[model samples]
Target: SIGLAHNVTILGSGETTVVLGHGYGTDQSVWKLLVPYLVDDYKVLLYDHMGAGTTNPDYFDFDRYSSLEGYSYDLIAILEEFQVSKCIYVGHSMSSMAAAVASIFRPDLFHKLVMISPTPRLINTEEYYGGFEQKVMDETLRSLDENFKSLSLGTAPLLLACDLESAAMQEYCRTLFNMRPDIACCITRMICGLDLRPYLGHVTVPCHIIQSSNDIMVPVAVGEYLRKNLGGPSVVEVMPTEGHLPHLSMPEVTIPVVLRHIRQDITD
Candidate 1:
């Protein structure tokens, strides 16, 4: 109740806190399966992004969220509000960069970062293949503009890469449906042009990159890119999953892997 802006929820209590940030087209519930396991040993923090389904739509500002820095500031604000320092941060997709950016701006605030299906850039470069072409990105954005519902409905199962009728897919679809079309469109446009590689070097916090074996949004190579580019000591763990949201689609398989990285002792 204290943090209203992001619908922040804090669970359990421990010497350290674990903060989870969901990806695009999803809410804090994306981490539902993972949270239970963490709460026994650590405090868990979960919250929605500004334009997420669970967040108050009126609080969303297009101009303010035009860049990832804005989202990063929001993360910092949430941490500051809760007086959380040196917490372990977990971010999916878009929020991955947001967490990294937050760690960069305030190195004192984060001890570690877990980036799931993370991509520093979505558009392919001459030397880097970020898994999408500029043309494809533009087309996707246009598709969002033309038919948000169609895009959301179709993207739900595709993002999860799970059985169409599975609860995971349904949950993700519901959140996507709950998001405002205009907001989703604008957020997509921002993601299409994002380039957070330059900011990676500033993230001094140790990081653990979790990449699904095959994600439509982020390729395995991108995970290696993050491991090499991140300023602090970083390692990439590829889950034997097929989609961008393994934590949600296959939590039974993903939970232990997440716990392993998060609970492991860090020399630094």
Candidate 2:
């Protein structure tokens, strides 16, 4: 696995640590809204994933990152390097799986996990529905290839609003374009290829699955499935939001719920 770096911003001198991991198709900047609330109370660590838009391309390794284990290793390395003994992992979308993988392998480094709009698998299975199928994934990839810029911009309507201003949309378009097409394609493949059901029992850390009540990308049932299988001290809270990016669209609601969990005493 490629070496990972941590960009830490400390607010208050609290013993608690919070690590924010972004989802696919975005970078650490995605956590901009939530950081303000977290930094004041906890040591906040933000870093880009190897293939994320802001990351150096030299760090991308197809063989090493072909599965989630590599990313988990990166997380473990970061924690050990920084001497973070206990942390609350806050992961959005695909990073939720990464957080779960890390917790499974190095339970001592983390105290609890808060997964926002998480899905263990994104593709449909014979006995389960994962919101997309192989054919759909192929078509989505094809569309991304055919109209990378326009489609990325167009996503704002489905993600934000039809009448929203174009300035931020244009900025997001640039970030999407900055991503190497092949790397982005590989990241998408990784997300769609995963099926974490068998590994859920390995996650001994307490978990909280936060869902956007009307998320377009992850169905609410996915959150239920996560809560059921994560094994210990699991709770599911459906935020009254509309989009998949609740941390951005509804920080007012998301931040407090996260704070409630982070501030709770975990030593029993």
Candidate 3:
């Protein structure tokens, strides 16, 4: 329907427009288990980043995608094109910042925010604990450049905390395979290079934080940081599970938690 026709898909005829923004190294398919859970009562929107999944590679620009703000531009464009007056932006991982950037820029375009495994900053400082250390990040980037497949799959133990043969592990692998090495590299650098802590004050939209207990990427303390620092009202829910990809590995735990937030927002 827009510059991302190949990248976007709309489902259901419900009133609320819930846009699902996926994290890095994966595509819209990452929301598979949770789709059916909402498709019946809410209009669901899903899309891939510049070079992930079915997105047209021609739309990706290294200059524009050099930072997380570029990803924000894509979300703002999509929301404006669709003209959703009261939509909720549900995002995971880095997409959490993507959605937060959009909300900060166009607060009127959204109703609420549901952040699954979100972190305002990924790198830790003396006053902040965003998780990864610069030393670790340096190693992570080298690993990505050396072998994207292994980086994507090797994290399964932390992403699923399940056997390699598990369905969750398999699906996460499929989404990982959907990413182009160069695109993944660009995104990795982009997310790693960002520090949204200063801009947290710009995000005034109502927010919800959904975090997994044992996320190798985003620790629970990051969620706490968001709740306390966000310029708007916020709440936190620590899921009793392991891994960052709860929706992928344990939707049985993730689905109900997300649905409750969605419905709670509607009621409020």
Candidate 4:
């Protein structure tokens, strides 16, 4: 815990535990609204990825963190540090891959997974559709780089989640996702360069994929691919809201599904 990239607060009194990790362009704070509901009945573990949000520079290794493996390491580190024998993992966006990779190596750390807006690959192959043109992916990354250096890091991802409505949620996306431009570029390259498809068959824990409607970042098809390809007994549930941050944008719709999944984890 002391040498971690950032601090993680363990909240709640229950022995039932749930670990939550946020995606790129966002940090642990994004889970605030969602955490409250869980904390009442479960212990919640939360932390920020290095170079993301307000992370500790001492533990931040840019070279080591240049890819998804680094994020996976953080998950393993946290589980060990907290002596978490087993728990439910809930991750969003790219963090979903991190969860899968971690569980691949240490399947004993988790009993179940809740992946939201996950993407196994950004670039599409002849047999698969990853939801972005390589040309479009580059442009999107450049635009995202520009946002971090100028407009604000969260802007591009939110814009990509364009169907986003609600003034306060827009503001929420803008302010909380700010990060370093250099780090943003590094993480972007890391995220887009990843092809986690080959590793999907290694995931040993059962997974619940919660995809939102028409996410520009992660389409409905990706969710379908995840459910079909993952090694675990996976279930995919779609939300009505057309936004990337469904928990924040439509908790009423998102929370119930998550609650049901988490409670029924062992059996499912």
Clashing pairs in 4: none
The digit string of per-residue lDDT tens for model 3 on 118-184 reads: 8766787877777888788878777677777777677666666777888877776776677677877
- lDDT scores in order: 0.86, 0.74, 0.81, 0.77
Model 4, 1-268: lDDT tens digits are 4435566878886887899887766777778777878888998888777777577545567798887888888889888988886789998888878988998889999878888888899787788898778887777667665564544434544634543466535655564556556776777778877899999888878988898877767778988898888897998888786677776667777878877877885443
- Cα lDDT, model 2, residue 183: 79
TM-score of each predicted structure versus truth = 0.95, 0.87, 0.93, 0.88
Better of 1 and 4 by TM-score: 1
RMSD of each: 1.5, 2.9, 2.0, 2.7
lDDT (10s digit) by residue, model 2, range 40-126: 678887777778767777778888788988888887887787778778888887787787888877889888888888888878878
lDDT of 1 at 235: 83
**Model 4 residue 230 distance off true place after TM-score fit, in angstroms:** 0.9
Candidate 1 structure quality by residue, lDDT tens digits, 201-259 = 87788998988998988889998998888888998889988888888888877889888
* Descending-lDDT candidate ranking: 1, 3, 4, 2
Off by over 4 Å in 2: 1-11, 142-147, 159-171, 265-268
Alpha-carbon shift of residue 247 in model 3 (angstroms): 0.8
**What is the lDDT for 241 in model 3?**
79
Residue 41 error, candidate 3, Å:
2.3
